[PDB]
Design an enzyme around this catalytic site. Structure first.
Site, PDB file in Angstrom:
ATOM      1  N   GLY A 247       0.814  -1.209   0.000  1.00 48.83           N
ATOM      2  CA  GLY A 247       0.000   0.000   0.000  1.00 48.83           C
ATOM      3  C   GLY A 247       0.842   1.250   0.000  1.00 48.83           C
ATOM      4  N   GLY A 248       0.774   1.998   1.092  1.00 52.61           N
ATOM      5  CA  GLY A 248       1.276   3.349   1.118  1.00 52.61           C
ATOM      6  C   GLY A 248       0.238   4.361   0.641  1.00 52.61           C
TER       7      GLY A 248
ATOM      8  N   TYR B 121       0.525   6.651  -1.698  1.00 57.55           N
ATOM      9  CA  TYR B 121       0.448   6.884  -3.147  1.00 57.55           C
ATOM     10  C   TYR B 121      -0.462   5.881  -3.841  1.00 57.55           C
ATOM     11  CZ  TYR B 121       1.939   7.449  -8.018  1.00 57.55           C
ATOM     12  OH  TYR B 121       1.957   7.620  -9.365  1.00 57.55           O
TER      13      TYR B 121
ATOM     14  N   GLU C  19      -4.238   3.496   3.354  1.00 57.36           N
ATOM     15  CA  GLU C  19      -4.610   4.747   3.995  1.00 57.36           C
ATOM     16  C   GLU C  19      -5.821   5.417   3.324  1.00 57.36           C
ATOM     17  OE1 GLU C  19      -1.045   7.209   4.476  1.00 57.36           O
ATOM     18  OE2 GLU C  19       0.159   5.452   4.929  1.00 57.36           O
ATOM     19  N   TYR C  20      -7.083   5.035   3.607  1.00 61.19           N
ATOM     20  CA  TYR C  20      -7.535   4.131   4.673  1.00 61.19           C
ATOM     21  C   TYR C  20      -8.838   3.423   4.221  1.00 61.19           C
ATOM     22  CZ  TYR C  20      -4.478   6.941   7.640  1.00 61.19           C
ATOM     23  OH  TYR C  20      -3.369   7.676   8.096  1.00 61.19           O
TER      24      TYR C  20
ATOM     25  N   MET D  94       0.289   5.666  13.070  1.00 57.04           N
ATOM     26  CA  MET D  94       0.954   6.767  12.368  1.00 57.04           C
ATOM     27  C   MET D  94       0.693   8.040  13.096  1.00 57.04           C
ATOM     28  SD  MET D  94       0.574   5.584   8.373  1.00 57.04           S
ATOM     29  CE  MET D  94      -1.181   5.272   8.486  1.00 57.04           C
ATOM     30  N   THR D  95       1.288   8.125  14.286  1.00 54.41           N
ATOM     31  CA  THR D  95       1.159   9.304  15.149  1.00 54.41           C
ATOM     32  C   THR D  95       2.181  10.396  14.761  1.00 54.41           C
ATOM     33  OG1 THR D  95       2.342   7.878  16.671  1.00 54.41           O
ATOM     34  CG2 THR D  95       0.040   8.328  17.120  1.00 54.41           C
TER      35      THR D  95
ATOM     36  N   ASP E 261       2.446  13.509  11.126  1.00 53.54           N
ATOM     37  CA  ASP E 261       1.618  14.185  10.131  1.00 53.54           C
ATOM     38  C   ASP E 261       0.312  14.677  10.728  1.00 53.54           C
ATOM     39  OD1 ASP E 261       3.515  13.972   8.096  1.00 53.54           O
ATOM     40  OD2 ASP E 261       2.084  13.207   6.635  1.00 53.54           O
TER      41      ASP E 261
ATOM     42  N   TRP F 271       8.991   6.248  10.193  1.00 56.49           N
ATOM     43  CA  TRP F 271       9.068   6.501   8.764  1.00 56.49           C
ATOM     44  C   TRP F 271      10.068   7.642   8.606  1.00 56.49           C
ATOM     45  CZ3 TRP F 271       7.510   4.755   4.075  1.00 56.49           C
ATOM     46  CH2 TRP F 271       7.752   5.628   3.010  1.00 56.49           C
TER      47      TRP F 271
HETATM   48  C1  LIG Z   1       3.281   5.660   3.075  1.00 58.58           C
HETATM   49  C2  LIG Z   1       3.808   6.727   2.608  1.00 58.58           C
HETATM   50  C3  LIG Z   1       4.383   7.956   2.068  1.00 58.58           C
HETATM   51  O1  LIG Z   1       4.670   7.848   0.682  1.00 58.58           O
HETATM   52  C4  LIG Z   1       5.635   8.846   0.284  1.00 58.58           C
HETATM   53  C5  LIG Z   1       4.961  10.153  -0.169  1.00 58.58           C
HETATM   54  C6  LIG Z   1       3.497   9.942  -0.568  1.00 58.58           C
HETATM   55  C7  LIG Z   1       5.087  11.305   0.823  1.00 58.58           C
HETATM   56  O2  LIG Z   1       4.251  11.069   1.965  1.00 58.58           O
HETATM   57  C8  LIG Z   1       4.950  11.128   3.229  1.00 58.58           C
HETATM   58  O3  LIG Z   1       6.177  10.998   3.279  1.00 58.58           O
HETATM   59  N1  LIG Z   1       4.108  11.283   4.239  1.00 58.58           N
HETATM   60  C9  LIG Z   1       4.455  11.222   5.649  1.00 58.58           C
HETATM   61  C10 LIG Z   1       3.368  10.418   6.372  1.00 58.58           C
HETATM   62  N2  LIG Z   1       3.438   8.999   6.081  1.00 58.58           N
HETATM   63  C11 LIG Z   1       2.440   8.276   5.532  1.00 58.58           C
HETATM   64  N3  LIG Z   1       1.432   8.830   5.013  1.00 58.58           N
HETATM   65  N4  LIG Z   1       2.419   6.934   5.631  1.00 58.58           N
HETATM   66  C12 LIG Z   1       3.293   6.211   6.362  1.00 58.58           C
HETATM   67  O4  LIG Z   1       4.131   6.678   7.157  1.00 58.58           O
HETATM   68  N5  LIG Z   1       3.142   4.895   6.206  1.00 58.58           N
HETATM   69  C13 LIG Z   1       3.862   3.942   7.011  1.00 58.58           C
HETATM   70  C14 LIG Z   1       4.647  12.653   0.191  1.00 58.58           C
HETATM   71  C15 LIG Z   1       4.976  13.859   1.060  1.00 58.58           C
HETATM   72  C16 LIG Z   1       5.315  12.878  -1.120  1.00 58.58           C
HETATM   73  O5  LIG Z   1       6.520  13.035  -1.173  1.00 58.58           O
HETATM   74  O6  LIG Z   1       4.462  12.833  -2.295  1.00 58.58           O
HETATM   75  C17 LIG Z   1       5.049  13.095  -3.572  1.00 58.58           C
HETATM   76  C18 LIG Z   1       4.476  14.406  -4.127  1.00 58.58           C
HETATM   77  C19 LIG Z   1       4.161  15.458  -3.080  1.00 58.58           C
HETATM   78  C20 LIG Z   1       4.774  11.891  -4.498  1.00 58.58           C
HETATM   79  C21 LIG Z   1       3.348  11.365  -4.327  1.00 58.58           C
HETATM   80  O7  LIG Z   1       4.942  12.270  -5.861  1.00 58.58           O
HETATM   81  C22 LIG Z   1       5.844  10.854  -4.215  1.00 58.58           C
HETATM   82  O8  LIG Z   1       7.070  11.421  -4.676  1.00 58.58           O
HETATM   83  C23 LIG Z   1       8.230  10.621  -4.390  1.00 58.58           C
HETATM   84  C24 LIG Z   1       9.134  11.369  -3.395  1.00 58.58           C
HETATM   85  C25 LIG Z   1       9.034  10.386  -5.680  1.00 58.58           C
HETATM   86  O9  LIG Z   1       7.837   9.375  -3.741  1.00 58.58           O
HETATM   87  C26 LIG Z   1       6.838   8.602  -4.361  1.00 58.58           C
HETATM   88  C27 LIG Z   1       5.639   9.451  -4.786  1.00 58.58           C
HETATM   89  C28 LIG Z   1       5.458   9.376  -6.310  1.00 58.58           C
HETATM   90  C29 LIG Z   1       6.513   7.488  -3.375  1.00 58.58           C
HETATM   91  C30 LIG Z   1       5.830   6.372  -4.161  1.00 58.58           C
HETATM   92  C31 LIG Z   1       5.706   7.952  -2.130  1.00 58.58           C
HETATM   93  C32 LIG Z   1       6.521   8.271  -0.839  1.00 58.58           C
HETATM   94  C33 LIG Z   1       7.160   6.999  -0.337  1.00 58.58           C
HETATM   95  O10 LIG Z   1       7.550   9.249  -1.070  1.00 58.58           O
END
Ligand SMILES: C#CCO[C@@H]1[C@@H](C)[C@H](OC(=O)NCCNC(=N)NC(=O)NC)[C@@H](C)C(=O)O[C@H](CC)[C@@](C)(O)[C@@H]2OC(C)(C)O[C@H]([C@@H]2C)[C@H](C)C[C@@]1(C)O
Ligand SMILES: [Cl-]
Length: 498
Positions: free
Chosen positions: A94-95, A97, A143-144, A211-212, A214, A402
């Site tokens: 998941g995640g 994205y 999520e979620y 996920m305490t 964000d 994370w």
């Molecule tokens: C579970 C999660 C968070 O996902 C991160 C992404 C979704 C990241 O989200 C976070 O780091 N959020 C912090 C909170 N964590 C969570 N929601 N979940 C979590 O901790 N799960 C265990 C956000 C801030 C992000 O960087 O999104 C970018 C654009 C803003 C995004 C969606 O393009 C993206 O950009 C990169 C940096 C290239 O990463 C990818 C993804 C394509 C990957 C696939 C998502 C990731 C890992 O960076």
């Protein structure tokens, strides 16, 4: 005695897998080889992330993934188990994205758990992937799920559990049995999607990793700490959505469990889980972030806390103004809104205009840039003392974070967590937990121990009177009451007998 879990996400994007290398950090900034033996000993779990659910409604790698390179990366992680026989390499499905309500694979999550046969196929694909790649367990980070999806999700977890248990027997892995976790909501708005069925969700799990973090971000109107341990009365408060969950409770029961407004804190999320019957503390793992969230356009007076701001929420970052002064990783990633702890140390150490400030109620650090109007909310080794102390005091299962690639190079954050739980010479008996706001909710799962005079038939009890009867301590909701406690609606169960 029981060792606290220490659960670290290892994330690597598909392009980095496909070009994997341990000798060029412009291609792969955080190869497996950065997880040294010493780091490996400090971890109990590494969550490899992320796999997905494809349109065949099975667990699957991103189809663009080079399979032989994927194996090689995963093999490097499982080789770490040679330095630590407690260590597990989980994988995570998941995640945000893939799985958020507007995510690219969202419908697959909904459909994979929708029917008995769909769940059987999905559950099987999970265990098959685990066995084929050498993983030690399954983590789900959807999520979620919501509403109508929750019964399906619960059934999917129950089925994965049984299949994991078969596998453990088949491989004689009783010393390190295959495990099942999820990344759970750490704030009440998302938690309310499945809150009423929390016991059922947790029952098949080894842990629910909250996920305490964000808990603040560019989508809020007011800057705040993203992972405050306890509440600050000067900070924003929020509507308690849980009081509208389909629980079947009375007004008094709802009110006592769900004060509203409330402070959105780590302690709140933890207590909200403990309030529910059948949710044991040892299964609850506290999430922490190894990253800060940055805000721009903040006005002064309180260090940038609780200020309006001008930080774009849109995705992708809508321009090339990379305003997080000193953040080189932000330029590389074209987004100024999130900086790794590793980067934050460098930003603080250089001449970039930040002060490191400390909120003694929330027990969390923050950066303030007075000249440009910037605010950064993050966690460090000091905030982790309080969180670790809270983990021991509340008898939680451990800590999750994370993510690993955001620790500093010597991995000081992970070492700190390990030391606060396991080092013989670390003492926190005198660590002061402060006067920050506690979440005071009480529900069926966390009734305090109390005494009171035994209930007496024929006696007329006023409003607020406290008696003991059949195992519990009960309180009249109005007066004058003569009914036996628990036999009608006049009595509130407020506590339990030793
Ligand atoms: C579970 C999660 C968070 O996902 C991160 C992404 C979704 C990241 O989200 C976070 O780091 N959020 C912090 C909170 N964590 C969570 N929601 N979940 C979590 O901790 N799960 C265990 C956000 C801030 C992000 O960087 O999104 C970018 C654009 C803003 C995004 C969606 O393009 C993206 O950009 C990169 C940096 C290239 O990463 C990818 C993804 C394509 C990957 C696939 C998502 C990731 C890992 O960076
Ligand atoms: Cl175990």
């Amino acid at each position: 005695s029981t060792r606290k879990a220490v659960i670290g996400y290892y994330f690597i994007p598909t392009n980095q897998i496909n070009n994997y290398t341990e000798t060029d950090t412009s291609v792969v900034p955080f190869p497996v080889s950065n997880i040294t033996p010493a780091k490996a000993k400090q971890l109990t779990h590494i969550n490899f992330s992320f796999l997905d659910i494809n349109s065949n409604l099975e667990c699957a790698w991103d189809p663009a993934t080079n399979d032989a390179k994927a194996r090689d990366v995963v093999n490097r992680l499982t080789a770490l188990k040679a330095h630590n026989p407690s260590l597990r390499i989980m994988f995570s499905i998941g995640g945000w994205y893939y799985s958020n309500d507007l995510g690219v694979s969202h419908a697959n999550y909904v459909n994979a758990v929708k029917t008995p046969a769909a769940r059987t196929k999905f559950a099987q694909s999970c265990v098959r992937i685990m066995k084929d790649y050498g993983f030690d367990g399954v983590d789900i980070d959807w999520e979620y799920p919501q509403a109508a999806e929750v019964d399906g999700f619960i059934a999917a977890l129950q089925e994965i559990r049984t299949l994991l248990n078969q596998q453990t027997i088949a491989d004689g892995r009783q010393a390190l049995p295959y495990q099942l976790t999820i990344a759970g909501a750490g704030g009440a708005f998302f938690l309310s999607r499945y809150y009423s069925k929390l016991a059922q969700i947790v029952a098949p799990l080894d842990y629910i990793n909250l996920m305490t973090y964000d808990l603040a971000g560019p989508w809020e109107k007011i800057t705040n700490h993203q992972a405050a341990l306890f509440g600050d009365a000067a900070g924003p408060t929020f509507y308690n959505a849980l009081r509208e969950a389909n629980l079947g409770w009375s007004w008094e029961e709802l009110t006592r469990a769900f004060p509203s407004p409330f402070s959105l804190t780590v302690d709140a999320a933890v207590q909200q889980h403990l309030m529910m019957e059948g949710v044991p503390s040892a299964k609850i793992v506290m999430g922490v972030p190894f990253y800060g969230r940055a805000f721009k356009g903040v006005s002064g007076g309180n260090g940038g806390q609780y200020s309006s701001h001008s930080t774009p929420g849109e995705d992708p970052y809508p321009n090339a103004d990379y305003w997080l002064v000193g953040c080189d990783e932000c330029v590389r990633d074209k987004d100024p809104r999130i900086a790794s702890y590793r980067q934050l140390e460098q930003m603080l150490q250089g001449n970039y205009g930040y002060q490191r400030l400390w909120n003694d109620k929330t027990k969390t650090p923050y950066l303030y840039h007075a000249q440009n109007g910037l605010f950064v909310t993050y966690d460090d080794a000091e905030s982790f003392k309080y969180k670790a102390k809270y983990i021991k005091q509340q008898q939680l299962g451990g800590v999750m974070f994370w993510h690993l690639g955001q620790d500093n190079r010597n991995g000081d954050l992970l070492a700190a967590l390990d030391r606060y739980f396991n080092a013989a010479d670390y003492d926190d008996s005198q660590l002061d937990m402060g006067t920050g706001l506690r979440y005071t909710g009480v529900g069926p799962g966390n009734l305090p121990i109390m005494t009171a005079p035994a209930y007496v038939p024929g006696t007329t009890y006023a409003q607020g009177a406290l008696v003991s009867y059949q195992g519990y301590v009960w309180q009249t909701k109005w007066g004058y009451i003569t009914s036996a406690p628990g036999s009608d609606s006049a009595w509130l169960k407020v506590g339990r007998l030793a």
